[PDB]
Amino acid sequence: GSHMQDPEQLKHCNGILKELLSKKHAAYAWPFYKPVDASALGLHDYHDIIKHPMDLSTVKRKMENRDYRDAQEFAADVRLMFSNCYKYNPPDHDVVAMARKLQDVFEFRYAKMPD
Ligand SMILES: CC(=O)N1c2ccc(-c3cc[nH]n3)cc2[C@H](Nc2ccccc2Cl)C[C@@H]1C
């Protein structure tokens, strides 16, 4: 059920999203900008292992389309994006180090949600 605070919380989520897409974090955010193109990367098992792909451009489209009804729904997609990375890639892969750094950006700012 919609709460009076959902619009303000979604503004906080949009601020986080803008930050994740900003030049400040681009050195480690870039793998997450667009859907994994498994065929182009030669990762022909990706869609057998990952049931629900997610990436920042999809989160952005969903935000722009008013798909997210609350902050927790937004957070679930961001965390799904990171979880897919941790599931598919070896834990010592460069992309996993990037995911951990970007997830730190996300989690610490998400924790500051007005409530
Ligand atoms: C998000 C994610 O999990 N992945 C992902 C997605 C997109 C891209 C991408 C986009 C444009 N060029 N490459 C690359 C990767 C990862 N590779 C990778 C990443 C950083 C350094 C070195 C390497 Cl090898 C594989 C993995 C499946």
Curated annotation (Swiss-Prot):
Mutagenesis / variant outcome for changing residue 43 to A: Reduced binding to histone H4 acetylated at 'Lys-12' (H4K12ac)
Places the protein is found: Nucleus; Chromosome
Record annotation: effect of changing residue 36 to A: Abolished binding to histone H4 acetylated at 'Lys-12' (H4K12ac)
Domain spans labelled Bromo: 8-113
Subunit structure: Homodimer. Interacts with E2F1. Interacts with (acetylated) STAT3; promoting STAT3 recruitment to chromatin. Interacts with CTCF; promoting BRD2 recruitment to chromatin. (Microbial infection) Interacts with herpes virus 8 protein LANA1.
Record text about domains: The first bromo domain specifically recognizes histone H4 acetylated at 'Lys-12' (H4K12ac). It also specifically binds histone H4 acetyl-methylated at 'Lys-5' and 'Lys-12' (H4K5acme and H4K12acme, respectively). The second bromo domain recognizes and binds histone H4 acetylated at 'Lys-5' and 'Lys-12' (H4K5ac and H4K12ac, respectively).
Its job: Chromatin reader protein that specifically recognizes and binds histone H4 acetylated at 'Lys-5' and 'Lys-12' (H4K5ac and H4K12ac, respectively), thereby controlling gene expression and remodeling chromatin structures. Recruits transcription factors and coactivators to target gene sites, and activates RNA polymerase II machinery for transcriptional elongation.
Further information: Some specific inhibitors of BRD2 that prevent binding to acetylated histone are promising therapeutic molecules for the treatment of cancers or inflammatory diseases. ABBV-744, a small molecule, has been tested on tumors with success: ABBV-744 antiproliferative activity is mainly restricted to cell lines of acute myeloid leukaemia and prostate cancer and is able to displace BRD4 from chromatin. GSK046 (iBET-BD2), which specifically inhibits the second bromo domain, is a promising therapeutic small molecule for the treatment of inflammatory and autoimmune diseases.
Family, similarity comment: Belongs to the BET family.
Protein name as it appears in the record: Bromodomain-containing protein 2
Part of the intact protein present: 348 to 455 of 801
